[PDB]
Scaffold this active site. Structure first.
Site, PDB file in Angstrom:
ATOM      1  CB  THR A  67      -0.523  -3.415  14.252  1.00  0.00           C
ATOM      2  OG1 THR A  67       0.589  -2.543  14.493  1.00  0.00           O
ATOM      3  CG2 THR A  67      -1.521  -2.739  13.275  1.00  0.00           C
ATOM      4  CE1 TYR A  81       5.702   0.607  15.649  1.00  0.00           C
ATOM      5  CE2 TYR A  81       4.184   1.970  14.398  1.00  0.00           C
ATOM      6  CZ  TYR A  81       4.458   0.804  15.089  1.00  0.00           C
ATOM      7  OH  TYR A  81       3.495  -0.183  15.204  1.00  0.00           O
ATOM      8  CG  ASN A 107      11.785   2.719  13.061  1.00  0.00           C
ATOM      9  OD1 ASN A 107      11.583   1.688  13.710  1.00  0.00           O
ATOM     10  ND2 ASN A 107      10.881   3.210  12.191  1.00  0.00           N
ATOM     11  CG  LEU A 140      28.294  -8.914   8.325  1.00  0.00           C
ATOM     12  CD1 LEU A 140      28.123  -9.235   9.815  1.00  0.00           C
ATOM     13  CD2 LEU A 140      27.232  -7.924   7.858  1.00  0.00           C
ATOM     14  N   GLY A 184       3.508  -8.232  10.498  1.00  0.00           N
ATOM     15  CA  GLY A 184       2.695  -7.736   9.391  1.00  0.00           C
ATOM     16  C   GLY A 184       2.340  -8.794   8.361  1.00  0.00           C
ATOM     17  CD  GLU A 234       1.968  -7.811  15.256  1.00  0.00           C
ATOM     18  OE1 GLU A 234       3.212  -7.826  15.360  1.00  0.00           O
ATOM     19  OE2 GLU A 234       1.289  -6.770  15.503  1.00  0.00           O
ATOM     20  CD  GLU A 250      -0.391   1.255   3.389  1.00  0.00           C
ATOM     21  OE1 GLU A 250      -0.865   2.297   2.862  1.00  0.00           O
ATOM     22  OE2 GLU A 250       0.008   1.216   4.578  1.00  0.00           O
ATOM     23  CD  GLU A 300      37.886 -12.506   8.963  1.00  0.00           C
ATOM     24  OE1 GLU A 300      38.077 -11.951   7.864  1.00  0.00           O
ATOM     25  OE2 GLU A 300      38.661 -12.388   9.945  1.00  0.00           O
ATOM     26  N   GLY A 314       5.093  -7.828   5.541  1.00  0.00           N
ATOM     27  CA  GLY A 314       6.352  -8.188   6.194  1.00  0.00           C
ATOM     28  C   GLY A 314       6.556  -9.676   6.387  1.00  0.00           C
TER      29      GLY A 314
HETATM   30  N1  LIG Z   1      10.378  -1.240  15.088  1.00  0.00           N
HETATM   31  C1  LIG Z   1       9.344  -0.891  14.272  1.00  0.00           C
HETATM   32  N2  LIG Z   1       8.275  -1.697  14.227  1.00  0.00           N
HETATM   33  C2  LIG Z   1       7.229  -1.388  13.440  1.00  0.00           C
HETATM   34  C3  LIG Z   1       7.241  -0.171  12.618  1.00  0.00           C
HETATM   35  N3  LIG Z   1       6.067  -0.150  11.952  1.00  0.00           N
HETATM   36  C4  LIG Z   1       5.359  -1.256  12.322  1.00  0.00           C
HETATM   37  N4  LIG Z   1       6.065  -1.982  13.212  1.00  0.00           N
HETATM   38  C5  LIG Z   1       5.700  -3.272  13.836  1.00  0.00           C
HETATM   39  O1  LIG Z   1       5.528  -4.235  12.798  1.00  0.00           O
HETATM   40  C6  LIG Z   1       4.406  -5.082  13.062  1.00  0.00           C
HETATM   41  C7  LIG Z   1       3.285  -4.859  12.055  1.00  0.00           C
HETATM   42  O2  LIG Z   1       3.763  -5.051  10.726  1.00  0.00           O
HETATM   43  P1  LIG Z   1       3.774  -3.884   9.606  1.00  0.00           P
HETATM   44  O3  LIG Z   1       5.205  -3.824   9.125  1.00  0.00           O
HETATM   45  O4  LIG Z   1       3.068  -2.629  10.046  1.00  0.00           O
HETATM   46  O5  LIG Z   1       2.743  -4.592   8.559  1.00  0.00           O
HETATM   47  P2  LIG Z   1       2.931  -4.727   6.956  1.00  0.00           P
HETATM   48  O6  LIG Z   1       4.092  -5.635   6.675  1.00  0.00           O
HETATM   49  O7  LIG Z   1       2.893  -3.326   6.386  1.00  0.00           O
HETATM   50  O8  LIG Z   1       1.713  -5.671   6.557  1.00  0.00           O
HETATM   51  P3  LIG Z   1       0.226  -5.169   6.243  1.00  0.00           P
HETATM   52  O9  LIG Z   1       0.213  -3.731   6.707  1.00  0.00           O
HETATM   53  O10 LIG Z   1      -0.670  -6.113   7.004  1.00  0.00           O
HETATM   54  O11 LIG Z   1       0.207  -5.443   4.748  1.00  0.00           O
HETATM   55  C8  LIG Z   1       3.983  -4.725  14.470  1.00  0.00           C
HETATM   56  O12 LIG Z   1       4.719  -5.604  15.323  1.00  0.00           O
HETATM   57  C9  LIG Z   1       4.399  -3.261  14.608  1.00  0.00           C
HETATM   58  O13 LIG Z   1       4.637  -2.763  15.944  1.00  0.00           O
HETATM   59  C10 LIG Z   1       8.447   0.673  12.714  1.00  0.00           C
HETATM   60  O14 LIG Z   1       8.578   1.728  12.054  1.00  0.00           O
HETATM   61  N5  LIG Z   1       9.417   0.245  13.532  1.00  0.00           N
HETATM   62 MG   LIG Z   2       1.257  -2.131   6.026  1.00  0.00          MG
HETATM   63 MG   LIG Z   3      42.627 -13.021   7.253  1.00  0.00          MG
END
Ligand SMILES: Nc1nc2c(ncn2[C@@H]2O[C@H](COP(=O)(O)OP(=O)(O)OP(=O)(O)O)[C@@H](O)[C@H]2O)c(=O)[nH]1
Ligand SMILES: [Mg+2]
Ligand SMILES: [Mg+2]
Ligand SMILES: Nc1nc2c(ncn2[C@@H]2O[C@H](COP(=O)(O)OP(=O)(O)O)[C@@H](O)[C@H]2O)c(=O)[nH]1
Ligand SMILES: COc1ccc(CNc2c(-c3ccccc3O)nc3ccc(F)cn23)cc1
Ligand SMILES: [Ca+2]
Ligand SMILES: [Ca+2]
Lengths: 424, 440
Positions: free
Chosen positions: B179, B224, B228, B252, B143, B183, B71, B254, B146
């Site tokens: 979220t 976040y 990050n 890295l 996610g 999960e 998205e 190694e 993800g």
């Molecule tokens: N550390 C960190 N975690 C994040 C961030 N954004 C989302 N999360 C975590 O990631 C997980 C949710 O996955 P997302 O990456 O938002 O989901 P997506 O892969 O976009 O998948 P959909 O939105 O369902 O298509 C949760 O555990 C969130 O707390 C970020 O910027 N940093």
């Molecule tokens: Mg998403």
């Molecule tokens: Mg060497």
């Protein structure tokens, strides 16, 4: 028999090999660009053993520089004496070997080896009478270890009647790049036992301790270890590089040092150990070179017996005193030299000392105590191999567990064989 | 050469790429528009920073990377944000509709619509490379994109690029910022389907990072953006061996030789120090011994587990800044006598050290102090299996009643996949127990 062809492989191979050419080029009066600005005729009399004469009376090292990555070899060209090496003899790959024996021997290195052999053959052909090859490498990484032992095997195929020498740097946890070193070393020892006539065992364990205990370097770098390596390499090549009664060659060394063909692992020693002002008396050189503290392999020579010895004194000194002192340690420690090789200690003297020291001694020993080195590596190997740890790195390049088992067995056999003559 | 291609998947992947790439630009003096004054070789070069950045003829240094999300909202903010000029528009890839917190839609339904496009673009970067080392894949476990797109991508990458190395930085879910209820399912499905295709995987536990932000940076309720910025520091410490020249710099790969004793045991625990506020760092220089000691404090870890109640198989220290070997050795000697460090009987107990001279940097208007020196420890401990166990228990609670399973089955999955995946994690937990048992 004069010309030797030198090959240096991998990080270690090329680092120590660079220092060797730095050290001996100073000894033979050759400068950073290749011209002779010496003073003694003795400096040029057997310059042919290691250097080619070129257009304009330049001397060019008969040296082939090999690595699977360009890191180390760009450094060699950058460094103090880099511009002396013949640029066609720099033969390098791109991807490196990741401290993996298999990549050196079977995959990455296999791709590159035939180019190295074309430079070897180039240098071999314009040689009046080639005696053999010397290789500098470590046994612990992947290029100098695996590729290096691949080269050796190929060189033996093409030149089965010439001598093969290694300066082989054995690994230690005290100076350690990776946990897989014992694996790499055990795979290379298996090669060296079959395909070399002579191997100088430079143990990094022993170099670290000399640096720590006896030289008061609290935090020793590879530069500090290689200072000790190039002085030992200078010493064990003196008799080839200078005159004048000893018609010393690599074959003669092999014949007199190696009573049984697999037992050709030499413990080198040097005195005095440096990084001085008071020159040493011949008695002191003679005490020091034979001292455990002065050995380049971490083995107590009292735990074994000397099969053969070759000692080389450098400087202006009484040869009367040199015989007296060399006969004194034999007569005063006679249990430690095998009775069944009469007169196993042979001593030589050369008038030119090395840079810095007024007089020095280099020791070359085929002791049975070298087993301790192979036992140490056999133990580190088994710790891991009994749980097949880290093997996936090797099986992914096509190797089998059976090949490790074989190699473990050859080394343990070597150890048994050395143990056989300690008790005879 | 030795080029490294970064792939950022889903929101977490994308937003962490921003943090990372913003950070790398400051680390190498690359301006927002992509210009780099200190680079005299225009159009290309062999320099260490070129492992992460290609050059254009106009002097633009361009990330060797691809952002992918199903998205547009998260990637649209890269297209209009401070660094919009840094990326070629074809590197930033979006669909219209997300995976909706569903591994299945990310892997099959929405995912297969965009996968050929993603590989096509990854291919365009791969062909700018003279000696490609491998990929770095940033994504959440939790996610839908993800978890499921990443799995699909990893599978496909193993086909197009054979055994070329693949590293993951995986975000492990935590209740403070979570979220979705599902999960744990997504996590166990991705972990399972990715395990043969990943060569090394750095897990980051959102809770661990959340706790560090509250405790060490005095941040009342971290966003976040807060997390990050801390993560990018850890990522930067790990990739710094790829991006910088150095006498004492160990590469890295190694470290990886030491970190991965069997293919499945490829989950190193990271620990970073110092994380400290400017307020607290003023007139408070932290020595090498103090930051080294901080690496064995389990509050500084990226994953909540206890290495003290487990066994080490490796221990790597990646120092950056004003650090020299002497201080490191003394520091390690102190730690060996005074701390709880038990190795398995088949590993040598030596710590492997690497040092970069470039000191760490901070993003403008952040919470971290600029410090003279820093360290990331990468250890392989059996303790990390605790993280699998917690997550596997949450999975088991729901899976026993079939909660939510219909949402996965409706998008085409079968119950077989769920139990097949859970048994793989059961086996993995059993593997981490076996390696720790002494030999005979
Ligand atoms: N550390 C960190 N975690 C994040 C961030 N954004 C989302 N999360 C975590 O990631 C997980 C949710 O996955 P997302 O990456 O938002 O989901 P997506 O892969 O976009 O998948 P959909 O939105 O369902 O298509 C949760 O555990 C969130 O707390 C970020 O910027 N940093
Ligand atoms: Mg998403
Ligand atoms: Mg060497
Ligand atoms: N004495 C010494 N040992 C070295 C040197 N460089 C590397 N080593 C050792 O050599 C082994 C690693 O081999 P290396 O030559 O770097 O690998 P390769 O390039 O893949 O052959 C380890 O035991 C290191 O401690 C050096 O310059 N001197
Ligand atoms: C029983 O031990 C030996 C007997 C003969 C040889 C052959 N040549 C040689 C050597 C020697 C030969 C090749 C390379 C380096 C060298 O230093 N060094 C000596 C010292 C004394 C000597 F009598 C001969 N030497 C070697 C060892
Ligand atoms: Ca190849
Ligand atoms: Ca450039």
């Amino acid at each position: 028999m004069r010309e030797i062809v030198h090959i240096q492989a991998g990080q270690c191979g090329n680092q120590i090999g660079a220092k060797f050419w730095e050290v001996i080029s100073d000894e033979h009066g050759i400068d950073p660009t290749g011209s002779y600005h010496g003073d003694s005729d003795l400096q040029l009399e057997r310059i042919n053993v290691y250097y080619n004469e070129a257009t304009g009376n330049k001397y060019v090292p008969r040296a082939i520089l090999v690595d699977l990555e360009p890191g180390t070899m760009d450094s060699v060209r950058s460094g103090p004496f880099g511009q002396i090496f013949r640029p066609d003899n720099f033969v390098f790959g791109q991807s490196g070997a990741g401290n993996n024996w298999a990549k050196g021997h079977y995959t990455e290195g296999a791709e590159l080896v035939d180019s190295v052999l074309d430079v070897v053959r180039k240098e071999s052909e314009s040689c009046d009478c080639l005696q053999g090859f010397q290789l500098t490498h470590s046994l612990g990484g992947g290029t100098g270890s695996g590729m290096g032992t691949l080269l050796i095997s190929k060189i033996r195929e093409e030149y089965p009647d010439r001598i093969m020498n290694t300066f082989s740097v054995v690994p230690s946890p005290k100076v350690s790049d990776t946990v897989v070193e014992p694996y790499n070393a055990t795979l290379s020892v298996h090669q060296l036992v079959e395909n070399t006539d002579e191997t100088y065992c430079i143990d990094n364990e022993a170099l670290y301790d000399i640096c720590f205990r006896t030289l008061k370097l609290t935090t020793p770098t590879y530069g500090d270890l290689n200072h000790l390596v190039s002085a030992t390499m200078s010493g064990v090549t003196t008799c080839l590089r200078f005159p004048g009664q000893l018609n010393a060659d690599l074959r003669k060394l092999a014949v007199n040092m190696v009573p049984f063909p697999r037992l050709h692992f030499f413990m080198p020693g040097f005195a005095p150990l440096t990084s001085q002002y008071r020159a040493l008396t011949v008695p002191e050189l003679t005490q020091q070179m034979f001292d455990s503290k002065n050995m380049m392999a971490a083995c107590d020579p009292r735990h074994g017996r000397y099969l053969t010895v070759a000692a080389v004194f450098r400087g202006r000194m009484s040869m009367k005193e040199v015989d007296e002192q060399m006969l004194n340690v034999q007569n005063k420690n006679s249990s430690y030299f095998v009775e069944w090789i009469p007169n196993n200690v042979k001593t030589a003297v050369c008038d030119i000392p090395p840079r810095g020291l007024k007089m020095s001694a280099t020791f070359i020993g085929n002791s049975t105590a070298i087993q301790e080195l192979f036992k140490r590596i056999s133990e580190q190997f088994t710790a891991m191999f009994r749980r097949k740890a880290f093997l996936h790195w090797y099986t992914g390049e096509g190797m089998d567990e059976m090949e490790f088992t074989e190699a473990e067995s050859n080394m343990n056999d070597l150890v048994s064989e050395y143990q056989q003559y300690q008790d005879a | 050469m030795r080029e490294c291609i970064s792939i950022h998947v889903g929101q977490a992947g994308v937003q962490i790429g921003n943090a990372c790439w913003e950070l790398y630009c400051l680390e190498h003096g690359i301006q927002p528009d992509g210009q780099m004054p200190s680079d005299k070789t225009i159009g290309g070069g062999d320099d260490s920073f070129n492992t992460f950045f290609s050059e254009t003829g106009a002097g633009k240094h361009v990330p060797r990377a691809v952002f992918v999300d199903l998205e547009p909202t998260v990637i649209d903010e890269v297209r209009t944000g401070t660094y919009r000029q840094l990326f070629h528009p074809e590197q930033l890839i979006t669909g219209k509709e997300d995976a909706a917190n569903n591994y299945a839609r990310g892997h099959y339904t929405i995912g297969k619509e965009i996968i050929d496009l993603v590989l096509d673009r990854i291919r365009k970067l791969a062909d700018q490379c003279t000696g490609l080392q491998g990929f770095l894949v940033f994504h959440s476990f939790g996610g839908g994109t993800g978890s499921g797109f990443t799995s699909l991508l990893m599978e496909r990458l193993s086909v197009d690029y054979g055994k070329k190395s693949k590293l993951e930085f995986s975000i492990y879910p935590a209740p403070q910022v979570s979220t979705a209820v599902v999960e744990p399912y997504n996590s166990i499905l991705t972990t399972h389907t990715t395990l043969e295709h990943s060569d090394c995987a750095f897990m980051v536990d959102n809770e661990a990072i959340y706790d560090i932000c509250r405790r060490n940076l005095d941040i009342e309720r971290p966003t976040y953006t807060n997390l990050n910025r801390l993560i990018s520091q850890i990522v930067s410490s790990i990739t710094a061996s790829l991006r910088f020249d150095g006498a004492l710099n160990v590469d890295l790969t190694e470290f990886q030789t030491n970190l991965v004793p069997y293919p499945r045991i490829h989950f190193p625990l990271a620990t970073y120090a110092p994380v400290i506020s400017a307020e607290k760092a003023y007139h408070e220089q932290l020595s090498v011994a103090e930051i080294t000691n901080a690496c064995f404090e389990p509050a500084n870890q990226m994953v909540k587990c206890d290495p003290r109640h487990g066994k080490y198989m490796a221990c790597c220290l990646l120092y950056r800044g004003d650090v020299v070997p002497k201080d490191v050795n003394a520091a390690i000697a102190t730690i060996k006598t005074k701390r709880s460090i038990q190795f398995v009987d088949w590993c040598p107990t030596g710590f492997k050290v690497g040092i970069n001279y470039q000191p760490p940097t901070v993003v403008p208007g952040g919470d971290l102090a600029k410090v003279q020196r820093a360290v990331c420890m990468l250890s392989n401990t059996t303790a990390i299996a605790e993280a699998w166990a917690r997550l596997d228990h949450k999975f088991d609670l729901m899976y026993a009643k079939r909660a939510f399973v219909h949402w996965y089955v409706g998008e085409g999955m079968e119950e077989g996949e769920f139990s097949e995946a859970r048994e793989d994690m059961a086996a993995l937990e059993k593997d981490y127990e076996e390696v720790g048992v002494d030999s005979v």
